[PDB]
Design a binder for this molecule. Structure first.
Ligand code: ADP
Ligand code: BEF
Ligand code: MG
Length: 719
């Protein structure tokens, strides 16, 4: 029994090792750097302040309700931060750091599982590790993604209720790795198996087409996902379903320095056989504009040819036909060829295509007519007035249209891959489900565009959902034992920002964006002007900048975010010339044809803008989450260098402020956080027996209940 054998890998890798007076505080040696603390010993006090000795042996003073008291050393490495007497920033970080120093990357903080990326392998995900967590309560085993997974599974079986695990945090923090562990765990504890294996193999497929090397993560997820693992009433896996969100289609046509395009492009060019290579007119990455601009074509530690074998293997297991696999690769190759089309200026303003090589190669692989494609690109017919007239586009517009075609192809293909996978995995009458959400947390970059607003909008709703969940839990517990606290549902605090974004009346940002989009005469400038007209000095969550004419600020839960408006109209309409649509609807390829003829893939439904679709999909997601018992995982990146053993105070503390753990862990401290059953406290009339152990020593520090005794912050600690 590894849990009781101190020599087990369990004890070594998941527990603080077990063998056979004065007060301190955390202070800043430099008051400008609020996150760099040292430990100072308190030596004296007045009533409104402390005096402590710094490391450089000095004497300073600070107010009492400003002091960051250090918890007693015995608490260093505690598994649940709910046990800490003090929950100030430095204290919370200190406990995370003591654990991290011991390669203990998982820690609870109330409802949250906090997971700090180790950036090295830690052997805690083997089958033996899996077996240990089966059936164990959270407080019976060490913190681990497997423990939250198990707790969810048992809750599903015991309560006959659907569950969700929300795994968030910034890019590179560990969301996807932890999501994969959840799926591994469920697969093992609830599996047989062909199905289990098909479920596991869906991942590699999606990651090949949806992930890419960015500066923050060698394997960054460029789309969000909600994975529904389905179970029959006996508790065995019966199916799965995947919903994808906000695929970064722009990456296909542009990548920042040192970043890569999606993995699949490199897998194909490196793993294709001689036959395929000549048959798809392939070459090295350096010969494709869509792959030769960033300066990076490889990832240290990754073999694209090997990965390609893994990808094909996953495709076989899931059941993609050889013909379907070939067509998928034809689409990937065609996109690269489209990227190599060089438009040049003609006699007039109209672009021309001198060399037909890439056009023909693309047209050959896609199975479309090159003459029809060339015209669709350079001379699309537009409905001007009552006349349908072919317009001759210049180099810029021709290039942009080509890029639009590429993004539409990649986006539609990804959607098709997801639906194909769902066709194999989905139940179709499932009894219960455990849903896993793997999406980015709040994003605040140097430049924030429409995609950031969308993700921040999602996070506002998820944060509100968390706060409302807490309110309900506490309200129920208090109203159960009858115990007068009036607390406010902090979820209400999120409504103003949410309304600013998605409100109908008065119209919010998305509604104004839609209004500017589906009617003529609008530009980025008319759009930003309208937003200012509606919200500047009129909505408390909005800010018109002092100088910029193209940005606006929104006060989000995690801070103000400044958005730039460039291209929002285009992003919201996501246009593709009808002649291009017509061009590809005639494709001879079996997959290409679905991408343009199946309305479930070719069209947003009845149009609707991108913002409206996003709003609807998020509302559907929230409605599903509301029917579940939720579990929360906060992934934390230790630094911005992808290095192990380097837990950077500033980097970590910022994430703790913006993800809700600092705020959340304190909410319970308002009122009576500790509640213990009478009989368990005394160890006849339990109530009186307790009234007597307490009276043997301030009644205001406690409020008896119907089954438990309620203590105020720190009181239980004193006893
Ligand atoms: N628990 C972990 N153990 C080992 N490596 C990890 C772990 N979690 C994160 N990784 C490392 O960090 C990288 C990024 O993690 P990932 O889950 O892709 O981040 P996100 O999905 O939050 O953008 C991984 O590819 C891996 O190298
Ligand atoms: F880059 Be991680 F997927 F957010
Ligand atoms: Mg990811």
């Amino acid at each position: 029994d590894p849990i009781h054998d101190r020599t087990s890998d369990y004890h070594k890798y998941l527990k603080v090792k077990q063998g056979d007076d004065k007060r301190y505080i955390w202070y800043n040696p430099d008051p400008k750097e609020r996150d760099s603390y040292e430990c100072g010993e308190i030596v004296s006090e007045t009533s409104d302040s402390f005096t402590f000795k710094t490391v450089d042996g000095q004497d300073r003073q600070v107010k009492k309700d400003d002091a960051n008291q250090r918890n007693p050393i015995k608490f260093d490495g505690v598994e649940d931060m709910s046990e800490l007497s003090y929950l100030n920033e430095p204290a919370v970080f200190h406990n995370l750091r003591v654990r991290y120093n011991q390669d203990l990357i998982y820690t609870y903080s109330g409802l949250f599982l906090v997971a700090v990326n180790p950036f090295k392998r830690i052997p805690i995900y083997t089958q033996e590790m899996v077996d240990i967590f089966k059936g164990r309560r959270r407080n019976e085993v060490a913190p681990h993604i497997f423990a939250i997974s198990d707790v969810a599974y048992r809750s599903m079986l015991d309560d006959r209720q659907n569950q969700s695990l929300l795994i968030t945090g910034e890019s590179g923090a560990g969301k996807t790795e932890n999501t994969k562990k959840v799926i591994q765990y469920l697969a093992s504890v609830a599996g047989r198996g062909v199905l289990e294996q098909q479920i596991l193999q869906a991942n590699p497929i999606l990651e090949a087409f949806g992930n890419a090397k960015t500066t923050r993560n060698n394997n960054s997820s460029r789309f969000g996902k909600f994975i529904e693992i389905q179970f029959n009433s006996a508790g065995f896996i019966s199916g799965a379903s995947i919903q994808s969100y906000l695929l970064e289609k722009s990456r296909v046509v542009f990548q920042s320095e040192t970043e890569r395009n999606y993995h699949i492009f490199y897998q194909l060019l490196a793993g294709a056989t001689a036959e395929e290579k000549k048959a798809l007119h392939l070459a090295g990455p350096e010969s494709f504009n869509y792959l030769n601009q960033s300066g990076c074509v490889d990832i240290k530690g990754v073999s694209d040819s090997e990965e390609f074998k893994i990808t094909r293997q996953a495709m076989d297991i899931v059941g993609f036909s050889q013909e379907e696999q070939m067509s998928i690769f034809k689409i990937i190759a065609g996109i690269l060829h489209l990227g190599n089309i060089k438009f040049e200026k003609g006699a007039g303003e109209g672009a021309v295509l001198k060399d037909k090589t890439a056009l023909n190669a693309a047209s050959t692989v896609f199975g479309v007519n090159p003459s029809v494609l060339e015209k669709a690109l350079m001379e699309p017919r537009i409905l001007a007035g009552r006349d349908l007239v072919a317009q001759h586009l210049n180099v810029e517009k021709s290039s942009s249209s080509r890029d639009a075609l590429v993004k539409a192809l990649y986006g539609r293909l990804f959607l098709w891959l997801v639906k194909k996978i769902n066709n194999v995995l989905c139940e179709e009458r499932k009894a219960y489900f455990i849903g896993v959400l793997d999406i980015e947390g709040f994003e605040i970059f140097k430049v924030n565009s429409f995609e950031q607003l969308c993700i921040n909008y999602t996070n506002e709703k998820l944060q509100q959902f968390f706060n409302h969940h807490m309110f309900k839990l506490e309200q129920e517990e208090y109203l159960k034992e009858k115990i007068n606290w009036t607390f406010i549902d902090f979820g209400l605090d999120s409504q103003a920002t949410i309304d600013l974004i998605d409100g109908r009346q008065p119209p919010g940002i998305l509604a104004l964006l839609d209004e500017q989009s589906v009617f003529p005469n609008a530009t980025d400038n008319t759009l930003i002007t309208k937003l200012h007209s509606h919200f500047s000095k009129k909505n408390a969550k909005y800010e018109e900048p002092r100088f910029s004419k193209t940005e606006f600020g929104v006060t989000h839960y995690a801070g103000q975010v400044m958005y730039e408006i460039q291209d929002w109209l285009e992003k919201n309409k996501d246009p593709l010339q009808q002649d291009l649509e017509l061009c590809f609807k005639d494709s001879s390829d079996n997959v290409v044809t679905k991408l343009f003829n199946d309305p479930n893939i070719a069209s947003r439904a009845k149009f609707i803008t991108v913002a409206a679709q996003y709003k609807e999909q998020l509302a559907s997601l929230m409605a599903t989450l509301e029917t579940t018992n939720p579990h929360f995982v906060r992934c934390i990146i230790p630094n911005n260098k992808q290095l192990p053993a380097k837990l950077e105070d500033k980097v970590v503390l910022d994430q703790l402020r913006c993800n809700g753990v600092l705020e959340g862990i304190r909410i319970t401290r308002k009122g009576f956080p500790n509640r213990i059953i009478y009989a368990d406290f005394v160890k006849e009339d339990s109530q009186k027996a307790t009234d007597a152990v307490l009276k043997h020593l301030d009644p205001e520090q406690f409020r008896f209940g119907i089954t438990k005794i309620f203590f105020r912050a720190g009181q239980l600690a004193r006893i």
